[PDB]
């Protein structure tokens, strides 16, 4: 009724189901969809599908999934300090994590059910998007130790390439990914 | 928090404590603002004294450099040791420690202790007094900045 | 401690015992100031108004963890002889400290 | 459960004409009787005091005591943070007045005090504050009763 | 019983009344009587009563009352500034409206029901008091725009004349208004 | 049921018993036994037993008990500010009260039922511990008034002497008490 | 609803001789098994521990671990409000001990640790704290077991 998930029907349902997809009214008001609360949700079928994933998608897919989950957890942890001290007090390493978490939230989790292309997404397309995001994060992490300012990293034009990747069709996506990886590598090579 | 009467009473007690804390913080902020406005007047007075201390020392130095000779002043300045006894003591203000500046320069280290170039020696005295007036301005400003940031944090 | 100003008053301060630097442009002022910030030594620096308007605008990312040294603006030779009202500086300072800018 | 919103206290407030509330903090500090002046209230007090009954300075003295105690209990909590050295010259008067009030006017023990003795003690406590700062009391009563020291009653308080 | 207006009887009364005179305990604690909270109170009969006011009291009554309402609104908007700094350390225009609001609050809204002449007040007396306050505010605004000191205006005995206006008897009030409405002009003309 | 003190059985029991020893779940969670909630507990037999304590234990024992209760009340009062602005914002004279309250809670009120010696405690041993704690508090306050910082007071080795007086045997306590009493006097004299 | 005050766990706790309570917060961080030590309780622990049964230093080590973990958990709520940069050294030590405890003692995976290995890890974690702060442990056991390094167990 009121979003109160202590009501008897929800509590009786949670004792037998194997997956729990919790929705949030806070994300729905800001038009963030599918508005899945990734902190309260869980799935008990993840450990059994790993042999299927390791031969049907890629051998390193669970590692990338765990890395994405760890990045989301670190962003959620840093968001308390962000709103209790202000974004100016954070160090550049934490600013990079905050920005990468924002990029992940805007470009991978968000999906449009009415768009003619974004309504459907294959497993390999999501794998490519995760690879691009993790490669960008690794390059930006390497650039921090070299003394590159965080403002120089963020104003790079390769950020828009990652954001627009989910709108590419399935037939054109491998050509997009193959060029985008080299674009990321060259863009982080050309500085400092 | 499960719904019980004891939990409800605890929550109401927490609300009362929060309101009392808000009132106490408002009183503390008022006291900090009063101290800030007390300090800003002394800051203005120190700065306007530093202005005259700069002006008269500059005039004396210009007169000494003009009518004793630039060579005489340069030769006098060639035997002046640089200051090394700069001291930065610390003092507490509202739970924060701030530096206070002072120097321990011995006067007799300069060449020609008898002032045959009298105007040059007077200019040296004027510049020493200029530094001894500047340190007060520095201390007052470094206190004022910390008081301002404490007011910001309380707000 | 060191003072960066015109060469006439730089060596005049050196007559008292300070390390006076003769400079007239903001680029050399920024370079010398960052050299003094990165090195260990004295904690008080006086800068003329003709070189740097705000001392924090050059160490906004350098002195946030080591704010102990004092960077102070000072009046030049020409400015001191003609004089100015220090109430404008305090009016700027109160705005930079409490934000409201209204003061009486 | 020390709850003022319980039905038994709630329905009592609709019928009665005031309340006297005991304080647990005063009880734990050793004060007997632990009557708390600030939350207490008497509705019909104005009809029983004045001229021709008890004394004419009753209402103004009571109001001044209430206001001064309310100021003192508020200063006392800020003392714990900002310290006594940061206070003004009158905040230290109010802080001492609150302690003297709690130690003398309330903590009376098993004594039997008439109204005249209680008013004398109240005027002795009000003498600690500077003359003319008693805004709630007119100057006519101030010129007649202000000035007595508490040490004259401290021989046998 | 709870103080707040969320009690069911108050909520049910809220939907069927045309006027609402909310009393506040803070004004009662400060001995400000009547304790009518002018921020939380409202009335829905003003527009219908406007034709009657302009014919029986004075032609300029509604606009002059709206000026008083706007002045009271302006004084409440500066309270967040007086929370930090003292009222004396403000701009001349900011000080003038605060003093005018204090004058209104302590000399027009306040009444004593137990007093012989402060328990009743007709419409003409209130209109005259408001007109005097408006004239004083306008002359003080002109003087502030000419750059006069604030303390030279607060020293004037006009403050006592307006302050005692509520205690003037009904039969003696026209002479008092006739004296004051030109005494204010004479006091303001004597200044530099 | 559920630890709710508003249970009708508890409410009926509250009106007929002379002593009420309320227990705390939070103290039992952190293994602080006997876990008696000091704020909620009370006893009505304190005044009647006072003539017996003067004859059988010590002449000044009720005064020491009242001083300990006053210190606990003062410590409880200051905890409303520690939760607000942190412990470091308090003055040294209040940090001393906080540390003395912590000392009392850790050393006097705590008791281990399964220990060989701490399972039983006579009245004179508790009186000696209370006397030691009050003497230490008075000497610490006297040192604070002389300008000694609180950090070096808390680091004195006599603190370990007080904290392990629980496990001293009953027959060995009269010597330990006299040694610790001389050490308390000696420690605060050479320090300042 | 993760509710300990529900009638079924409440009536279960009054009959049984203890409980083992799992924590969802520890589960969300990848810790297995996610056993919460503070709500857990064993009523019959004192019968099966001590000299001649497991070792002479079991109960004191358990109590010291409980107190130190409670102190760290309490300090976490303080740094959630005032920030970690204003901490002293002791609060920082307790805060680091809590994280080391959660990362090493609770989190063990599928391995079968013996009692001696678990006691060795417990003494290694207690070595991070100052020796004088171990109030609940007798000095006889401290002189025998204190000083172990954690890097000699986990690399």
mmCIF file with all atom_site columns, N, CA, C and O in Angstrom, chain A residues 151-182:
data_model
loop_
_atom_site.group_PDB
_atom_site.id
_atom_site.type_symbol
_atom_site.label_atom_id
_atom_site.label_alt_id
_atom_site.label_comp_id
_atom_site.label_asym_id
_atom_site.label_entity_id
_atom_site.label_seq_id
_atom_site.pdbx_PDB_ins_code
_atom_site.Cartn_x
_atom_site.Cartn_y
_atom_site.Cartn_z
_atom_site.occupancy
_atom_site.B_iso_or_equiv
_atom_site.pdbx_formal_charge
_atom_site.auth_seq_id
_atom_site.auth_comp_id
_atom_site.auth_asym_id
_atom_site.auth_atom_id
_atom_site.pdbx_PDB_model_num
ATOM 1   N N  . UNK A 1 151 ? 40.047 17.521 -13.764 1.00 0.00 ? 151 UNK A N  1
ATOM 2   C CA . UNK A 1 151 ? 39.264 18.296 -14.720 1.00 0.00 ? 151 UNK A CA 1
ATOM 3   C C  . UNK A 1 151 ? 39.680 17.987 -16.153 1.00 0.00 ? 151 UNK A C  1
ATOM 4   O O  . UNK A 1 151 ? 38.844 18.003 -17.064 1.00 0.00 ? 151 UNK A O  1
ATOM 5   N N  . UNK A 1 152 ? 40.968 17.711 -16.372 1.00 0.00 ? 152 UNK A N  1
ATOM 6   C CA . UNK A 1 152 ? 41.429 17.328 -17.701 1.00 0.00 ? 152 UNK A CA 1
ATOM 7   C C  . UNK A 1 152 ? 40.867 15.975 -18.119 1.00 0.00 ? 152 UNK A C  1
ATOM 8   O O  . UNK A 1 152 ? 40.584 15.759 -19.303 1.00 0.00 ? 152 UNK A O  1
ATOM 9   N N  . UNK A 1 153 ? 40.708 15.055 -17.167 1.00 0.00 ? 153 UNK A N  1
ATOM 10  C CA . UNK A 1 153 ? 40.176 13.732 -17.483 1.00 0.00 ? 153 UNK A CA 1
ATOM 11  C C  . UNK A 1 153 ? 38.696 13.822 -17.836 1.00 0.00 ? 153 UNK A C  1
ATOM 12  O O  . UNK A 1 153 ? 38.232 13.205 -18.802 1.00 0.00 ? 153 UNK A O  1
ATOM 13  N N  . UNK A 1 154 ? 37.937 14.606 -17.068 1.00 0.00 ? 154 UNK A N  1
ATOM 14  C CA . UNK A 1 154 ? 36.489 14.657 -17.243 1.00 0.00 ? 154 UNK A CA 1
ATOM 15  C C  . UNK A 1 154 ? 36.075 15.379 -18.519 1.00 0.00 ? 154 UNK A C  1
ATOM 16  O O  . UNK A 1 154 ? 35.074 15.001 -19.139 1.00 0.00 ? 154 UNK A O  1
ATOM 17  N N  . UNK A 1 155 ? 36.816 16.406 -18.930 1.00 0.00 ? 155 UNK A N  1
ATOM 18  C CA . UNK A 1 155 ? 36.480 17.154 -20.135 1.00 0.00 ? 155 UNK A CA 1
ATOM 19  C C  . UNK A 1 155 ? 36.890 16.441 -21.418 1.00 0.00 ? 155 UNK A C  1
ATOM 20  O O  . UNK A 1 155 ? 36.797 17.041 -22.494 1.00 0.00 ? 155 UNK A O  1
ATOM 21  N N  . UNK A 1 156 ? 37.347 15.197 -21.331 1.00 0.00 ? 156 UNK A N  1
ATOM 22  C CA . UNK A 1 156 ? 37.733 14.455 -22.520 1.00 0.00 ? 156 UNK A CA 1
ATOM 23  C C  . UNK A 1 156 ? 36.495 14.126 -23.353 1.00 0.00 ? 156 UNK A C  1
ATOM 24  O O  . UNK A 1 156 ? 35.443 13.789 -22.797 1.00 0.00 ? 156 UNK A O  1
ATOM 25  N N  . UNK A 1 157 ? 36.577 14.218 -24.685 1.00 0.00 ? 157 UNK A N  1
ATOM 26  C CA . UNK A 1 157 ? 35.393 13.936 -25.513 1.00 0.00 ? 157 UNK A CA 1
ATOM 27  C C  . UNK A 1 157 ? 35.031 12.464 -25.595 1.00 0.00 ? 157 UNK A C  1
ATOM 28  O O  . UNK A 1 157 ? 33.970 12.139 -26.141 1.00 0.00 ? 157 UNK A O  1
ATOM 29  N N  . UNK A 1 158 ? 35.872 11.564 -25.079 1.00 0.00 ? 158 UNK A N  1
ATOM 30  C CA . UNK A 1 158 ? 35.571 10.139 -25.152 1.00 0.00 ? 158 UNK A CA 1
ATOM 31  C C  . UNK A 1 158 ? 34.468 9.743  -24.175 1.00 0.00 ? 158 UNK A C  1
ATOM 32  O O  . UNK A 1 158 ? 33.942 8.627  -24.260 1.00 0.00 ? 158 UNK A O  1
ATOM 33  N N  . UNK A 1 159 ? 34.101 10.632 -23.248 1.00 0.00 ? 159 UNK A N  1
ATOM 34  C CA . UNK A 1 159 ? 33.008 10.342 -22.326 1.00 0.00 ? 159 UNK A CA 1
ATOM 35  C C  . UNK A 1 159 ? 31.674 10.231 -23.050 1.00 0.00 ? 159 UNK A C  1
ATOM 36  O O  . UNK A 1 159 ? 30.845 9.385  -22.696 1.00 0.00 ? 159 UNK A O  1
ATOM 37  N N  . UNK A 1 160 ? 31.447 11.076 -24.058 1.00 0.00 ? 160 UNK A N  1
ATOM 38  C CA . UNK A 1 160 ? 30.207 11.022 -24.821 1.00 0.00 ? 160 UNK A CA 1
ATOM 39  C C  . UNK A 1 160 ? 30.103 9.747  -25.650 1.00 0.00 ? 160 UNK A C  1
ATOM 40  O O  . UNK A 1 160 ? 28.993 9.269  -25.908 1.00 0.00 ? 160 UNK A O  1
ATOM 41  N N  . UNK A 1 161 ? 31.241 9.182  -26.063 1.00 0.00 ? 161 UNK A N  1
ATOM 42  C CA . UNK A 1 161 ? 31.223 7.934  -26.819 1.00 0.00 ? 161 UNK A CA 1
ATOM 43  C C  . UNK A 1 161 ? 30.675 6.786  -25.979 1.00 0.00 ? 161 UNK A C  1
ATOM 44  O O  . UNK A 1 161 ? 29.944 5.928  -26.487 1.00 0.00 ? 161 UNK A O  1
ATOM 45  N N  . UNK A 1 162 ? 31.026 6.751  -24.692 1.00 0.00 ? 162 UNK A N  1
ATOM 46  C CA . UNK A 1 162 ? 30.510 5.714  -23.804 1.00 0.00 ? 162 UNK A CA 1
ATOM 47  C C  . UNK A 1 162 ? 29.026 5.933  -23.531 1.00 0.00 ? 162 UNK A C  1
ATOM 48  O O  . UNK A 1 162 ? 28.240 4.978  -23.492 1.00 0.00 ? 162 UNK A O  1
ATOM 49  N N  . UNK A 1 163 ? 28.619 7.190  -23.340 1.00 0.00 ? 163 UNK A N  1
ATOM 50  C CA . UNK A 1 163 ? 27.224 7.474  -23.041 1.00 0.00 ? 163 UNK A CA 1
ATOM 51  C C  . UNK A 1 163 ? 26.289 7.154  -24.192 1.00 0.00 ? 163 UNK A C  1
ATOM 52  O O  . UNK A 1 163 ? 25.145 6.745  -23.980 1.00 0.00 ? 163 UNK A O  1
ATOM 53  N N  . UNK A 1 164 ? 26.760 7.338  -25.426 1.00 0.00 ? 164 UNK A N  1
ATOM 54  C CA . UNK A 1 164 ? 25.940 7.077  -26.602 1.00 0.00 ? 164 UNK A CA 1
ATOM 55  C C  . UNK A 1 164 ? 26.033 5.634  -27.080 1.00 0.00 ? 164 UNK A C  1
ATOM 56  O O  . UNK A 1 164 ? 25.453 5.309  -28.122 1.00 0.00 ? 164 UNK A O  1
ATOM 57  N N  . UNK A 1 165 ? 26.747 4.770  -26.356 1.00 0.00 ? 165 UNK A N  1
ATOM 58  C CA . UNK A 1 165 ? 26.988 3.415  -26.841 1.00 0.00 ? 165 UNK A CA 1
ATOM 59  C C  . UNK A 1 165 ? 25.733 2.554  -26.761 1.00 0.00 ? 165 UNK A C  1
ATOM 60  O O  . UNK A 1 165 ? 25.563 1.620  -27.553 1.00 0.00 ? 165 UNK A O  1
ATOM 61  N N  . UNK A 1 166 ? 24.842 2.845  -25.810 1.00 0.00 ? 166 UNK A N  1
ATOM 62  C CA . UNK A 1 166 ? 23.679 1.984  -25.615 1.00 0.00 ? 166 UNK A CA 1
ATOM 63  C C  . UNK A 1 166 ? 22.619 2.208  -26.686 1.00 0.00 ? 166 UNK A C  1
ATOM 64  O O  . UNK A 1 166 ? 21.694 1.399  -26.819 1.00 0.00 ? 166 UNK A O  1
ATOM 65  N N  . UNK A 1 167 ? 22.729 3.291  -27.455 1.00 0.00 ? 167 UNK A N  1
ATOM 66  C CA . UNK A 1 167 ? 21.776 3.563  -28.522 1.00 0.00 ? 167 UNK A CA 1
ATOM 67  C C  . UNK A 1 167 ? 22.171 2.935  -29.852 1.00 0.00 ? 167 UNK A C  1
ATOM 68  O O  . UNK A 1 167 ? 21.419 3.059  -30.823 1.00 0.00 ? 167 UNK A O  1
ATOM 69  N N  . UNK A 1 168 ? 23.321 2.274  -29.921 1.00 0.00 ? 168 UNK A N  1
ATOM 70  C CA . UNK A 1 168 ? 23.779 1.647  -31.155 1.00 0.00 ? 168 UNK A CA 1
ATOM 71  C C  . UNK A 1 168 ? 23.051 0.323  -31.344 1.00 0.00 ? 168 UNK A C  1
ATOM 72  O O  . UNK A 1 168 ? 22.782 -0.399 -30.376 1.00 0.00 ? 168 UNK A O  1
ATOM 73  N N  . UNK A 1 169 ? 22.723 0.001  -32.593 1.00 0.00 ? 169 UNK A N  1
ATOM 74  C CA . UNK A 1 169 ? 22.024 -1.238 -32.896 1.00 0.00 ? 169 UNK A CA 1
ATOM 75  C C  . UNK A 1 169 ? 22.941 -2.443 -32.695 1.00 0.00 ? 169 UNK A C  1
ATOM 76  O O  . UNK A 1 169 ? 24.163 -2.319 -32.578 1.00 0.00 ? 169 UNK A O  1
ATOM 77  N N  . UNK A 1 170 ? 22.323 -3.626 -32.646 1.00 0.00 ? 170 UNK A N  1
ATOM 78  C CA . UNK A 1 170 ? 23.078 -4.855 -32.424 1.00 0.00 ? 170 UNK A CA 1
ATOM 79  C C  . UNK A 1 170 ? 23.997 -5.177 -33.595 1.00 0.00 ? 170 UNK A C  1
ATOM 80  O O  . UNK A 1 170 ? 25.090 -5.718 -33.395 1.00 0.00 ? 170 UNK A O  1
ATOM 81  N N  . UNK A 1 171 ? 23.572 -4.861 -34.820 1.00 0.00 ? 171 UNK A N  1
ATOM 82  C CA . UNK A 1 171 ? 24.389 -5.170 -35.988 1.00 0.00 ? 171 UNK A CA 1
ATOM 83  C C  . UNK A 1 171 ? 25.604 -4.257 -36.086 1.00 0.00 ? 171 UNK A C  1
ATOM 84  O O  . UNK A 1 171 ? 26.650 -4.672 -36.597 1.00 0.00 ? 171 UNK A O  1
ATOM 85  N N  . UNK A 1 172 ? 25.488 -3.020 -35.607 1.00 0.00 ? 172 UNK A N  1
ATOM 86  C CA . UNK A 1 172 ? 26.568 -2.050 -35.714 1.00 0.00 ? 172 UNK A CA 1
ATOM 87  C C  . UNK A 1 172 ? 27.436 -1.973 -34.467 1.00 0.00 ? 172 UNK A C  1
ATOM 88  O O  . UNK A 1 172 ? 28.450 -1.266 -34.482 1.00 0.00 ? 172 UNK A O  1
ATOM 89  N N  . UNK A 1 173 ? 27.058 -2.661 -33.391 1.00 0.00 ? 173 UNK A N  1
ATOM 90  C CA . UNK A 1 173 ? 27.782 -2.518 -32.130 1.00 0.00 ? 173 UNK A CA 1
ATOM 91  C C  . UNK A 1 173 ? 29.230 -3.012 -32.146 1.00 0.00 ? 173 UNK A C  1
ATOM 92  O O  . UNK A 1 173 ? 30.072 -2.335 -31.531 1.00 0.00 ? 173 UNK A O  1
ATOM 93  N N  . UNK A 1 174 ? 29.585 -4.173 -32.731 1.00 0.00 ? 174 UNK A N  1
ATOM 94  C CA . UNK A 1 174 ? 31.009 -4.566 -32.714 1.00 0.00 ? 174 UNK A CA 1
ATOM 95  C C  . UNK A 1 174 ? 31.937 -3.562 -33.379 1.00 0.00 ? 174 UNK A C  1
ATOM 96  O O  . UNK A 1 174 ? 33.047 -3.331 -32.881 1.00 0.00 ? 174 UNK A O  1
ATOM 97  N N  . UNK A 1 175 ? 31.506 -2.945 -34.483 1.00 0.00 ? 175 UNK A N  1
ATOM 98  C CA . UNK A 1 175 ? 32.323 -1.917 -35.119 1.00 0.00 ? 175 UNK A CA 1
ATOM 99  C C  . UNK A 1 175 ? 32.452 -0.681 -34.240 1.00 0.00 ? 175 UNK A C  1
ATOM 100 O O  . UNK A 1 175 ? 33.491 -0.012 -34.261 1.00 0.00 ? 175 UNK A O  1
ATOM 101 N N  . UNK A 1 176 ? 31.408 -0.360 -33.473 1.00 0.00 ? 176 UNK A N  1
ATOM 102 C CA . UNK A 1 176 ? 31.491 0.741  -32.520 1.00 0.00 ? 176 UNK A CA 1
ATOM 103 C C  . UNK A 1 176 ? 32.481 0.429  -31.405 1.00 0.00 ? 176 UNK A C  1
ATOM 104 O O  . UNK A 1 176 ? 33.312 1.271  -31.052 1.00 0.00 ? 176 UNK A O  1
ATOM 105 N N  . UNK A 1 177 ? 32.413 -0.786 -30.854 1.00 0.00 ? 177 UNK A N  1
ATOM 106 C CA . UNK A 1 177 ? 33.275 -1.175 -29.740 1.00 0.00 ? 177 UNK A CA 1
ATOM 107 C C  . UNK A 1 177 ? 34.739 -1.241 -30.158 1.00 0.00 ? 177 UNK A C  1
ATOM 108 O O  . UNK A 1 177 ? 35.630 -0.798 -29.415 1.00 0.00 ? 177 UNK A O  1
ATOM 109 N N  . UNK A 1 178 ? 35.002 -1.791 -31.349 1.00 0.00 ? 178 UNK A N  1
ATOM 110 C CA . UNK A 1 178 ? 36.371 -1.974 -31.820 1.00 0.00 ? 178 UNK A CA 1
ATOM 111 C C  . UNK A 1 178 ? 37.076 -0.634 -31.993 1.00 0.00 ? 178 UNK A C  1
ATOM 112 O O  . UNK A 1 178 ? 38.257 -0.494 -31.655 1.00 0.00 ? 178 UNK A O  1
ATOM 113 N N  . UNK A 1 179 ? 36.359 0.367  -32.501 1.00 0.00 ? 179 UNK A N  1
ATOM 114 C CA . UNK A 1 179 ? 36.901 1.712  -32.624 1.00 0.00 ? 179 UNK A CA 1
ATOM 115 C C  . UNK A 1 179 ? 36.939 2.443  -31.289 1.00 0.00 ? 179 UNK A C  1
ATOM 116 O O  . UNK A 1 179 ? 37.870 3.218  -31.049 1.00 0.00 ? 179 UNK A O  1
ATOM 117 N N  . UNK A 1 180 ? 35.963 2.200  -30.409 1.00 0.00 ? 180 UNK A N  1
ATOM 118 C CA . UNK A 1 180 ? 35.894 2.928  -29.148 1.00 0.00 ? 180 UNK A CA 1
ATOM 119 C C  . UNK A 1 180 ? 37.030 2.541  -28.211 1.00 0.00 ? 180 UNK A C  1
ATOM 120 O O  . UNK A 1 180 ? 37.535 3.387  -27.462 1.00 0.00 ? 180 UNK A O  1
ATOM 121 N N  . UNK A 1 181 ? 37.435 1.268  -28.224 1.00 0.00 ? 181 UNK A N  1
ATOM 122 C CA . UNK A 1 181 ? 38.566 0.860  -27.391 1.00 0.00 ? 181 UNK A CA 1
ATOM 123 C C  . UNK A 1 181 ? 39.848 1.576  -27.808 1.00 0.00 ? 181 UNK A C  1
ATOM 124 O O  . UNK A 1 181 ? 40.584 2.103  -26.959 1.00 0.00 ? 181 UNK A O  1
ATOM 125 N N  . UNK A 1 182 ? 40.115 1.632  -29.116 1.00 0.00 ? 182 UNK A N  1
ATOM 126 C CA . UNK A 1 182 ? 41.282 2.357  -29.606 1.00 0.00 ? 182 UNK A CA 1
ATOM 127 C C  . UNK A 1 182 ? 41.158 3.850  -29.337 1.00 0.00 ? 182 UNK A C  1
ATOM 128 O O  . UNK A 1 182 ? 42.162 4.522  -29.078 1.00 0.00 ? 182 UNK A O  1
#
